[PDB]
Design a protein around this nucleic acid. Structure first.
Ligand SMILES: [Zn+2]
Length: 86
RNA sequence: GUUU
């Protein structure tokens, strides 16, 4: 516990600041593959929750990607395997 | 700080 399924070829990205949009994240992660979707999680009024997910069409090594130290806006993004809690 |  907690029960969760690890989502293949998807990376959790947290520490997403308000000036970082989906397109900027896609442009960075394109170094790893053909990005299928970047989704920043927002509440129903479009307030970002400050985290999102990047998924790929190609198989990627999520463990290697999450070692990356990515710093756009002065803080390291917080990366992890993507889990859907069940 | 893990998507419904
Ligand atoms: Zn930027």
């Amino acid at each position: 516990l907690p029960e969760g399924k690890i989502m293949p070829n998807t990376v959790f990205v947290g520490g997403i600041d308000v000036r970082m949009d989906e397109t900027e994240i896609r442009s960075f992660f394109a170094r790893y593959g053909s990005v299928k979707e970047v989704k920043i999680i927002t509440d129903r009024t479009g307030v970002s929750k400050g985290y999102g997910f990047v998924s790929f069409y190609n198989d990627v090594d999520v463990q290697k990607i999450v070692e990356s130290q990515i710093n756009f806006h002065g803080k390291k993004l917080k990366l992890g395997p993507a889990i859907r809690k069940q």
